[PDB]
Design a protein around this ligand. Structure first.
Ligand SMILES: [Mg+2]
Ligand SMILES: [Mg+2]
Ligand SMILES: [Mg+2]
Ligand SMILES: [Mg+2]
Ligand SMILES: [Mg+2]
Ligand SMILES: [Mg+2]
Ligand SMILES: [Mg+2]
Ligand SMILES: [Mg+2]
Ligand SMILES: [Mg+2]
Ligand SMILES: [Mg+2]
Ligand SMILES: [Mg+2]
Ligand SMILES: [Mg+2]
Ligand SMILES: [Mg+2]
Ligand SMILES: [Mg+2]
Ligand SMILES: [Mg+2]
Ligand SMILES: [Mg+2]
Ligand SMILES: [Mg+2]
Ligand SMILES: [Mg+2]
Ligand SMILES: [Mg+2]
Ligand SMILES: [Mg+2]
Ligand SMILES: [Mg+2]
Ligand SMILES: [Mg+2]
Ligand SMILES: [Mg+2]
Ligand SMILES: [Mg+2]
Ligand SMILES: [Mg+2]
Ligand SMILES: [Mg+2]
Ligand SMILES: [Mg+2]
Ligand SMILES: [Mg+2]
Ligand SMILES: [Mg+2]
Ligand SMILES: [Mg+2]
Ligand SMILES: [Mg+2]
Ligand SMILES: [Mg+2]
Ligand SMILES: [Mg+2]
Ligand SMILES: [Mg+2]
Ligand SMILES: [Mg+2]
Ligand SMILES: [Mg+2]
Ligand SMILES: [Mg+2]
Ligand SMILES: [Mg+2]
Ligand SMILES: [Mg+2]
Ligand SMILES: [Mg+2]
Ligand SMILES: [Mg+2]
Ligand SMILES: [Mg+2]
Lengths: 95, 77, 190, 107, 140, 166, 148, 17, 97
RNA sequence: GCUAAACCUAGCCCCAAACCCACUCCACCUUACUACCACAACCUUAGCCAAACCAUUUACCCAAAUAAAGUAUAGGCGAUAGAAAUUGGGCGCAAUAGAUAUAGUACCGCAAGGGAAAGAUGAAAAAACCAAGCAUAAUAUAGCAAGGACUAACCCCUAUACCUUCUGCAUAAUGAAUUAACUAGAAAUAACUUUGCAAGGAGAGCCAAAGCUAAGACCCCCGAAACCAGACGA
RNA sequence: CCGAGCCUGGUGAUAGCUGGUUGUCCAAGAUAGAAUCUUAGUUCAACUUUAAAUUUGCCCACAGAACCCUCUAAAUCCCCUU
RNA sequence: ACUGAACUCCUCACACCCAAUUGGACCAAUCUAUCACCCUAUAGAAGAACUAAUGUUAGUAUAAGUAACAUGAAAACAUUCU
RNA sequence: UCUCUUACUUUUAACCAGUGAAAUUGACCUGCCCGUGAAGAGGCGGGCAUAACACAGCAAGACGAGAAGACCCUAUGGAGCU
């Protein structure tokens, strides 16, 4: 990715990242399952449900995603009626 | 020509040492050399040997006749 | 350091004159292979990693830190019997030797910093005296800084200036965070 | 290295221990400065230790010079006539004291 | 040329000082000198081990020499001296051999006596009156 | 360039006491920038190295080498000035104390080989130095006798110590 | 730098390249988590707790009406019009132990917070502010210097 | 399969005293 | 050889010339003077450098856009080339990604 | 004791300020520097390179610093590209350095074109020591050249040169005649560490569910065959 | 020095390939694998290091871990005590 | 029985024998601020350290006084001869 | 040409005199046999030999010197041709 822009000399975000992942303010990232729209006739219903769910990403994936994205995307946003509002903060977390 | 003073000064002191090796100066008595007081040295001569000398006598012991002849001749002019 | 700008630059390999062609073919001779005669390796070549252009070393400490700086410097002066308070910087005569011999008589020390409140309303007598004295220095209140105070052995202040310094430095704590630069009007600033 | 350097056989001056032990250190010459950090450690050595040290060994004559210098030093002279120069420089009172002891108990 | 080393002469002299007594170019040419001086310092380091080994070998030879001239083997002498609980190390025995030869003969004589008392004890089976010199002193 | 050798004739010693051996006279002389190889000059220098002046002039006369006439000139110049300026009584009683050749300053030209190849040729120059000492030449050290070998061998055996004891 | 390779010569591939196989980020399907993020409106929350504490310290004045401008001046809130903020949302939190009678002006309020204010005898109303009005109201003094 | 020769510049050889 | 053979002329530094004496005065222009001026208005020097700091690449970008029109043909070509170099260096090279 | 060594000042670099020279007599577009006789200029840059290939694609100066914002947006929707409204003199070099520069000269090339090196007394010239290499002064059994030693230089005993790439490597394989000078780790996010202030931090913008501000501390050198544009050559 | 002349410029072209990389001292410190136009290279994992928080880890005894194939060894997993 | 290690004991001392890598304690010289004033101190900075790139420049060696190179004869230096 | 080579002349050569290169070179105080290193030892192990120092020859060894590397493989290196 571009560490120093040629116009302004600041970092740039990889837009491939932004249209695939949701980052929560706490530091987690959310993705969809790969192939959730693919060939559903042959898949079993349990398999289908496992596909529909929005999952988290492990530490390294999360680290890589944060490097590929600017500080703007990491700020706290007070959207009106976002369905992900509750998930922004953690609860009862000791290490 | 290199900016700096320390390396240059060091080198001068090295050259001084080499010059001393080449032609050593004539030996001169320690009286004719810095950091000398004969009085204090006399007392220390007593104390080194753990001997309670009479300091007046010890002084008298160290003064040769050859010295006094030379001293008289020197003082004359 | 904040005011410092570096003027040193050196030419890189690309910026040195000539050095276009390959000096000799790679394979043929016994010689070590080269691409240009202006490479860092060569005599007369460009510099590998050198001073590059005008360089600025500008940064800002936070305001409250600089304020605290002034405070410490002033406490330290008074703690060590290096600080003196004066009704006015008014001199019986403009003869500069009078000021030197007074400092000698009062055990001020070799260097004295004289602070007045305003530049315009500084007395005639002190300005004449201090103009031709190297070690004694006259500044207005707004001039005062940590560096000069440390450089000079004595700090001399007036009663006008002491009230002024108190006001401004004490203002720094017990203020809000700004909404906009303080040069702009507020309901109670200036 | 042993080949690369000179050698001596073990000896003393004038069979030191035989009759009576004689302290070989004869003279000490301290060069200090009134101002300047190098001589700082040495300065307070002259504040305290010099006096009681000089009492402890009356055989040694101590000279303190107190002149401007970038490197303070000590010149140890011995009975036999050897001269040992040691640059005290930026050394704490304690490690200067250790030096002066080490000089005084050797030939 | 903002910064240039000004005192390389002194850095060079540090190696060359050691190299003075060598032969050939390596006594003065730095890129040669350094390599040999490194080897010299390593040699000198490992030579501590060998000094100690070799000194003992010299002592053992010297002791063997003096023992042989009274007409008993080295092992005989050294072993029997221990069973007499006279603990003198090789250094002093070798030193006695050269400088105090009367004392050395006495040591040799006592060793051979203990040797013989041992032989007598070996011959007998069961309980017999123990040799005078064979008797051991206990410490509690 | 250094020119120390020349200055050696400007040394003045203080007058001697009557109770002193008569100091031999002492002349230093040289020629600079001789077009001749320094090592080639060495052989001629080495030859005359300990002989008297006349005997050296004799040897140099019949010597076929180029530098031989050059050295002859230097020696005659040195002899002349010895008598004239250095207060030497007799011109015959001088011997060569030291005879040395140094490298003088050299130029570089080119030598053209085959293909395009070449080499750097050096126009060789050198200095010659001499020193003359007034008086008869030193008699050469006698060859080592069997008795001297024997004597020193005895000395050598007597120097042995019992090593690594007290 | 290690031993000589792509790493040591400093010619490592870009971030997110998996050496050949379809990289993690690419191989995931695209979904509109942030499809129209810049067009969404954002309201900064003011809690009743926050409001009460401001009144208790005399920072926000109850003898006068409250609007955006008064709160901002009080340092009760920070509003970034540029960052798609559209004013102040009034939240339920600390409904109990809210004892003050005020005329408050907010862009959004929850029914509970309305109830909380009207219980004490206060008046709450919601009023819309356009972005160009908002930047003006939040910081009036700079706007006054614009000469418009 | 041929390497041309190279001449050093003439100024070095033409140096005088 | 390459070491001096005499001591250079001693350098005397006048610590009490006017420039040394009034060094750093008015650095507190802001806090002591009602905030009329920032201290960064005491900075003199290049147009593109007064009260700003950046790496080489950033400095070049800035000089290009601020005094790019007014600078000499060959100087500007050198500057355009610098930027090309540094762009590749910083984006495509190094230890860490 | 030779060869040498040593030097401080010519000048130069980056800024700021300010809009620059176009020049006695004669000659000079013909074969320029030669007194003196019947055609005509404006026309998309490409390519290296990045994409770990390559084929669409890949920042390059356009007329206010900051912020909006690496946002909207664009894109084999991937590498990457990227708005607008709006806001407003010297901690420099000092003769292998610094300009190539004592000079675009000498020299090299048919031409376009390439392109050096170097100097040092003193107020006045109308006045001491240190690189390599050698010399002083060749050499005597035996062996990585030394170490342990020794009364003693050698003799005695112990001891498979260095760097780099390979699992070993003694040695195998690259590299070094030697001396002097020059010659190679440049930066972000995020963390940690130390301060100031603290539900707020910051000298507009930005962040904040103890955070925010400031500082500290992390990212090398030399080398192809090539490709393209414009000149020069029978 | 022509399977495509030479010069300047783009140009510090590019080089997963070769070569090099400059003071002292101390400390911790090695070989599960997977994908890859990939095996002369990267990325993930494993190991390694530093800092932090907190509680068990290693060695382990009983009990326990399959039939079929027509036949079964050194052993291994799990594991309180210590 | 003796000999036989850097193992172990003995008298003292103790951070002081792994590649890549990672952590740490110091520090040569130079410039700046302030000291100092026969060459230092505390800090701030930086073109900040070379036994090695068939590295680049200059000097001097090895091969090596080697390979190689050169003027027909006599004479009076008029001339003549081959 | 050879069986089967010989003799003489010139060039070279070797000596005296003048001028004076080049590749090469880690340092060298630079031996032989056997073993080891699987092949490959002047330098490692066991034996043997051995005052020092020029000049002339020879080509068995120094994996002898010098090159735009003959062959095989590799590069997500080029280029010409179809
Ligand atoms: Mg170029
Ligand atoms: Mg190139
Ligand atoms: Mg090349
Ligand atoms: Mg340059
Ligand atoms: Mg030709
Ligand atoms: Mg030559
Ligand atoms: Mg590379
Ligand atoms: Mg590509
Ligand atoms: Mg690449
Ligand atoms: Mg120059
Ligand atoms: Mg030049
Ligand atoms: Mg020398
Ligand atoms: Mg031997
Ligand atoms: Mg390799
Ligand atoms: Mg080999
Ligand atoms: Mg023709
Ligand atoms: Mg590869
Ligand atoms: Mg360790
Ligand atoms: Mg794979
Ligand atoms: Mg594939
Ligand atoms: Mg591959
Ligand atoms: Mg357990
Ligand atoms: Mg033992
Ligand atoms: Mg142990
Ligand atoms: Mg230990
Ligand atoms: Mg310092
Ligand atoms: Mg450097
Ligand atoms: Mg060097
Ligand atoms: Mg070669
Ligand atoms: Mg070579
Ligand atoms: Mg080199
Ligand atoms: Mg020769
Ligand atoms: Mg030969
Ligand atoms: Mg010949
Ligand atoms: Mg021959
Ligand atoms: Mg000849
Ligand atoms: Mg050659
Ligand atoms: Mg063999
Ligand atoms: Mg060999
Ligand atoms: Mg021969
Ligand atoms: Mg090849
Ligand atoms: Mg290809």
């Amino acid at each position: 990715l571009t560490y120093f822009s040629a116009r302004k000399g600041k970092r740039k975000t990889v837009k491939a990242v932004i249209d695939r992942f949701l980052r929560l303010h706490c530091g987690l990232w959310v993705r969809r399952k790969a192939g959730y729209k693919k060939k559903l006739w042959k898949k079993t219903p349990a398999r289908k449900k496992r596909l529909r769910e929005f999952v988290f990403c492990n530490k390294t994936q999360s680290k890589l995603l944060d490097k590929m994205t600017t500080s703007f995307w990491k700020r706290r946003n007070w959207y009106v009626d976002d369905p992900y509002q509750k998930y922004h903060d953690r609860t009862n977390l000791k290490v | 020509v290199k900016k700096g003073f320390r390396a240059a000064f060091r080198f001068q002191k090295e050259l001084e040492r080499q010059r001393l090796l080449r032609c050593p100066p004539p030996p001169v008595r320690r009286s004719e050399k810095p950091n000398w007081d004969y009085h204090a040295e006399i007392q220390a001569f007593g104390h080194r040997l753990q001997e309670n000398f009479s300091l007046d006598l010890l002084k008298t012991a160290f003064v040769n006749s050859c010295y006094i002849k030379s001293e008289e001749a020197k003082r004359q002019q | 350091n904040f005011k410092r700008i570096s003027y040193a630059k050196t030419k890189t390999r690309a910026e040195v004159r000539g050095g276009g062609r390959k000096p000799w073919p790679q394979k043929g001779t016994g010689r070590a292979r080269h691409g240009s005669i202006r490479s860092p390796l060569w005599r007369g070549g460009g510099v590998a990693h050198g001073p590059r252009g005008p360089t600025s070393y500008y940064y800002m400490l936070p305001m409250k830190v600089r304020a605290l700086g002034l405070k410490v410097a002033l406490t330290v002066k008074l703690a060590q019997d290096d600080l003196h308070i004066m009704d006015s910087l008014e001199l019986p005569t403009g003869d500069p030797q009078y000021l030197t011999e007074l400092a000698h008589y009062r055990r001020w020390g070799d260097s004295v910093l004289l602070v007045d409140l305003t530049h315009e309303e500084m007395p005639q007598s002190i300005v004449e005296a201090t103009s031709r004295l190297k070690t004694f220095n006259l500044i207005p209140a707004v001039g005062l800084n940590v560096h000069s105070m440390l450089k000079h052995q004595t700090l001399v202040l007036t009663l006008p200036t002491v009230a002024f310094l108190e006001d401004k430095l004490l203002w720094q704590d017990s203020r809000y965070r700004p909404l906009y630069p303080f040069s702009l009007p507020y309901s109670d600033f200036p | 290295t042993a080949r690369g350097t000179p050698s001596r056989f073990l000896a003393s001056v004038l069979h030191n221990g035989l009759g009576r032990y004689v302290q070989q250190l004869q003279r000490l010459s301290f060069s200090v400065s009134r101002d300047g950090a190098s001589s700082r450690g040495a300065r307070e050595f002259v504040e305290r230790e010099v006096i009681d040290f000089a009492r402890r060994n009356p055989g040694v004559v101590i000279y303190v010079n107190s002149r401007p210098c970038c490197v303070p030093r000590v010149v140890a002279e011995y009975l036999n006539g050897a001269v040992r120069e040691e640059s005290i420089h930026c050394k704490s009172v304690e490690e200067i004291s250790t030096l002066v002891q080490k000089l005084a108990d050797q030939s | 040329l903002r910064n240039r080393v000004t005192d390389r002469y002194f850095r060079i002299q540090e190696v060359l000082k050691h190299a003075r007594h060598f032969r050939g170019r390596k006594n003065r040419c730095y890129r040669l000198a350094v390599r040999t001086v490194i080897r010299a310092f390593v040699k000198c380091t490992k030579a501590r081990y060998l000094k100690k080994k070799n000194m003992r070998t010299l002592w053992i030879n010297r002791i063997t020499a003096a023992s042989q001239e009274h007409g008993l083997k080295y092992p005989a002498l050294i072993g029997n001296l221990v069973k007499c609980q006279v603990e003198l190390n090789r250094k002093v025995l070798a030193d006695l051999a050269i400088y105090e030869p009367k004392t050395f003969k006495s040591l040799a004589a006592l060793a051979s006596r203990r040797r013989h008392e041992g032989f007598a004890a070996a011959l007998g089976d069961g309980k017999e009156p123990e040799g005078i010199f064979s008797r051991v002193v206990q410490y509690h | 360039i250094s020119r120390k050798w020349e200055k050696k004739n400007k040394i003045v010693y203080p007058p001697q006491l009557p109770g002193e051996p008569r100091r031999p006279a002492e002349i230093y002389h040289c020629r600079r920038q001789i077009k001749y190889s320094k090592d080639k000059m060495w052989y001629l220098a080495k030859l005359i190295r300990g002989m008297s002046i006349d005997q050296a002039l004799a040897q140099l006369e019949f010597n076929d080498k180029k530098g031989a006439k050059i050295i002859k000139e230097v020696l005659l110049e040195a002899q002349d000035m010895a008598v004239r300026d250095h207060n030497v009584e007799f011109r015959s009683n001088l011997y060569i104390a030291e005879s040395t050749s140094g490298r003088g300053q050299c130029l570089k030209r080119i030598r053209y080989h085959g293909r395009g190849r070449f080499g750097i040729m050096e126009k060789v120059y050198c200095h010659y130095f001499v020193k003359l000492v007034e008086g008869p030449p030193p008699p050469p050290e006698p060859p080592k006798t069997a008795v001297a070998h024997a004597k020193e061998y005895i000395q050598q055996l007597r120097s042995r110590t019992i090593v690594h004891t007290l | 730098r290690g031993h000589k390779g792509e790493r040591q010569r400093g010619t490592r591939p870009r971030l997110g390249f998996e050496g050949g196989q379809t990289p993690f980020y690419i191989r995931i399907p695209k979904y509109g988590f942030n499809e129209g993020h810049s067009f969404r409106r954002q309201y900064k929350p003011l809690s009743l707790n926050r409001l009460q504490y401001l009144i208790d310290l005399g920072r926000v004045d109850p003898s006068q009406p409250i609007d955006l401008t008064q709160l901002v001046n009080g340092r009760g809130v920070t509003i970034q019009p540029l960052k798609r903020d559209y004013g102040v949302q009034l939240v339920e939190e600390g409904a109990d132990t809210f004892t003050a009678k005020v005329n408050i002006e907010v862009q959004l309020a929850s029914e509970l917070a309305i109830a909380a204010i009207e219980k004490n005898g206060g008046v709450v109303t919601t009023a819309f502010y356009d972005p160009r009005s908002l930047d003006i109201v939040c910081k009036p003094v700079p706007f006054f210097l614009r000469g418009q | 399969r041929f390497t041309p020769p190279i001449y050093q510049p003439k100024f070095k050889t033409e140096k005088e005293f | 050889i390459g070491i001096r053979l005499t001591l250079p002329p001693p350098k005397v530094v006048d610590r009490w010339n006017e420039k040394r004496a009034m060094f750093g005065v008015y650095d507190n222009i802001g806090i002591l003077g009602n905030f009329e001026k920032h201290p960064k208005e005491l900075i003199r020097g290049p147009i593109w450098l007064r009260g700003w700091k950046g790496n080489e690449l950033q400095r070049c970008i800035r000089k290009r856009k601020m005094v790019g029109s007014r600078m000499f043909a060959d100087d500007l070509h050198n500057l355009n080339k610098r930027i090309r170099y540094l762009y590749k260096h910083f984006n495509r090279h190094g230890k860490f990604r």
